[PDB]
């Protein structure tokens, strides 16, 4: 219940929040890349 | 032409985004005690 | 004004920045979903 | 074909992002006091 | 070496990580804008001709 | 009609790089929290 120990646990939780945000970003890159792959191979030759 | 699809990918971002919100909920929960 | 009080408020602000980023990501999904919907409902039938 | 539009969602992303950048600026300024 | 100092520096690293994420979102906006412009400037007139 | 392919590889490249730099910043934050 120490003040300093309570502060560390909040930063550790905040870091895990950031890590999942980073995973989300990586998947947004895959999503957008899927759009570029879909028009460069399916729409442009059509 | 076949319709475009990454529903699996977008659903994974929704799921990951909910985990991020829960971590913030844990953090703000501890700060309220200080 | 204690050093612990400042550390707490700084984390409170960092969490709010992360919450704002979380919102912007949810909207990026909506944005990408609207691009998917336009392709499958305007481009595909026409082509 | 009608041109594609998410101008409203793209603007919400912009405003939420700049709101995020301000919360960090206050956090770093609070840490500057220590 | 103090605990308050260690806590302060950890939040600095965390804040930098958030700033780097904010830039990546900024370029994601640009990435989506590139797609919107390509649809309205290359695909729409292509199917209209 | 003959259509130029869509290009933002440089646009997406920064994100992938800005993502990796963010991963390392969290690693350093967690590393300081070990000594506390």
Swiss-Prot record, chain A:
**Coiled coil segments of this chain:** 1-23
Q: Which domain of life is it from?
A: Viruses
Descriptive protein name: Fusion glycoprotein F1
Q: Which organism is it from?
A: Human parainfluenza 3 virus (strain Wash/47885/57) (HPIV-3)
Curated annotation (Swiss-Prot), chains B, D:
Which portions of this protein are annotated as coiled-coil regions? 9-34
Name this polypeptide is given: Fusion glycoprotein F1
Taxonomic placement: Viruses, Riboviria, Orthornavirae, Negarnaviricota, Haploviricotina
Source gene?
F
């Amino acid at each position: 219940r120490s003040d300093i120990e309570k502060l560390k646990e909040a930063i550790r939780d905040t870091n895990k929040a950031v890590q999942s945000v980073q995973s989300s970003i990586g998947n947004l890159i895959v999503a957008i890349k899927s759009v570029q792959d879909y028009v460069n191979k399916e729409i442009v030759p059509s | 032409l076949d319709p475009i699809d990454x529903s699996i990918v977008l659903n994974k971002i929704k799921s990951q985004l909910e985990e991020s919100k829960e971590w913030i909920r844990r953090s703000n929960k501890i700060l309220d005690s200080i």
